[model samples]
Target: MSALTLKGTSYKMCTDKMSFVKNPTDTGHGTVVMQVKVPKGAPCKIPVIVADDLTAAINKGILVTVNPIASTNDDEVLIEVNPPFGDSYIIVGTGDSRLTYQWHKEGSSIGK
Candidate 1:
């Protein structure tokens, strides 16, 4: 086993305004939706961590570190963290759909 480390992650909003649409319609078509948006110049941070067990760790009030990564497009960027016990980890991103992140294995990368 290895010692856990803290990672620092941060990002700035790339859009001027974001919107949340409760219901979206296409040419008057019946459609229901719940949308969230992040305004431009907005800054947000997500807590991420690499825990031995996610359910148990969260219950213990363990704070995870978020590590930011490079973006490949204009969409939201994300960080990935891999837990030791599960095949699927957690993903943290900005309120807007402009940033996203995933959890990876230990010793990979971390954000504080």
Candidate 2:
């Protein structure tokens, strides 16, 4: 399998807290959506990084960093499959939101 990393910085807690009453009871049960925007005149594939969890010391309004490794240079290259020269990629990260660190592309959840 491949690997990726995601780092979150300047995190601000949303006024609306994530709810669990409607979903699973596990605190870690959640999804993270990442949108990678490729610059104009860029390649088709782009490398990306994602993390599984944030540190406990991390708090609302704090900067959290997630590092997702790229398997290949193409993995880091974001190419334009279609559109006006530039395109954006959307990735879902799912897993336990309570944890401090996590690995991307692993068994853990990030987007879903």
Candidate 3:
């Protein structure tokens, strides 16, 4: 938290903002949306992790990885961490349209 000095402390208006949407749909692709403010040339970082939640499609004879694959747009940065990135979050997918994905410094973190 940022604050002012002296006997009382107060915070000024933040130049950055963030919004997160999780577990979006039950049938379609489970997309996580993170709407954030990175104005005034602020920087943002996002973490990516693929975890151990898989259900076998016996008929197909394959394992479906339900976790999200990190991505980005013009406003954000995405990092795909394969070997335990320190500042990170775990993604546990239900394979039933439930998905998860991460964290970093400098701004709001969201996994895709």
Candidate 4:
């Protein structure tokens, strides 16, 4: 299972439960690790996330545009990959995570 669709909700980076690093330029420096099963009552808008104006939105792929906000990132460290088993939540989308976005809207600028 593999997914990266946006704005309409769909995420499952299961490259055998996924390992990071497709496009990374700083943002806690490389492998902006993401594995979201969710807190779906809210908090899972990992949308177009750009900062400091990277012009073409830094390769304009998995770029940024979620919003000025904070939503459950206890500084990241949610790894319970016990054996051949996994549940969810290991997101640390801090300042500087490039790789990608969609027809976004959360303080959006057209997925800048």
Candidate 5:
């Protein structure tokens, strides 16, 4: 048999972040891959892979307030972005989201 791959995305933040979303099947010991989307000039922002645990959707375009003089006058901007060019994260796993277990492969690395 062939091993399946789980693909996911993580957005760039003031501090690099990792995302974990609920497994569609909530079971498996296949490889998991992740993509990193860097924002043009966005500013800041957690979690690991776990079965039954809700994985964080690392979709870009997250908005946050910068300086807030008043609730209505708060400056807001996207904290993440996905441009035409970007980096990605790839990993191999052999664990499922059940029993609160998770694993990742680490060898070469990328991103800034």
Candidate 6:
């Protein structure tokens, strides 16, 4: 039952493990480029996720700032996982590739 504190809300990390990799070149305030790897065979289809920019979200209070502890990623941003009712999905996490996360679904958890 791990949790991540971002912005003003605390999120419960799912009982699953995952990984995150930050893009090395993107620099400056709010400029973030990172991807995530969901656990194999999860209900979600996309395993590798290249997240979109979260500058607006951070500025608007949707998510909080992440301190840059890694050498490459220093923009210090947060990610909002899952997709809106649109053409693609969105996901985000800390730059460390060894962190676990929470997940939401619209279906049952048990497999067929």
RMSD per candidate (Å) reads 14.0, 16.3, 17.7, 15.4, 16.0, 15.9
- Candidate 6 residue runs with Cα over 4 Å from true position: 1-5, 21-25, 40-97, 100-112
Q: What does the lDDT come to for candidate 2?
A: 0.23
How close to the true structure is residue 111 of candidate 1, measured as C-alpha lDDT?
25
Candidate 4 residue-wise lDDT, 20-94, digit = tens: 333222233222323332222224333333322332223222323232221553211221111011111222232
**Candidate 6 backbone collisions, by pair:** 14-101, 14-102
- lDDT accuracy of residue 103 in candidate 4: 24
lDDT tens per residue, model 5, 46-85: 1122221223333211111121111222222222111112
- Summarize candidate 3's per-residue lDDT along 5-101 as a digit string, tens digits: 2101222222233223332121222222232222232232321223333221111111122212223222432212221222233332222322243
On lDDT, who's better, 1 or 2? 1
Model 2, 1-112: lDDT tens digits are 1211222432222211111212111123233222222222222222222221233222211112233222332222211111111111222212232211222321434432
lDDT of each: 0.30, 0.23, 0.25, 0.26, 0.22, 0.30
TM-score of 5: 0.17
Checking candidate 3 for backbone clashes, the offending pairs are none
Deviation (Å) of 7 in candidate 4: 6.4
TM-score per prediction, in order, is 0.26, 0.21, 0.19, 0.19, 0.17, 0.27
lDDT value, residue 80 of candidate 5: 18
Model 3, residue 16: C-alpha shift (Å): 3.3
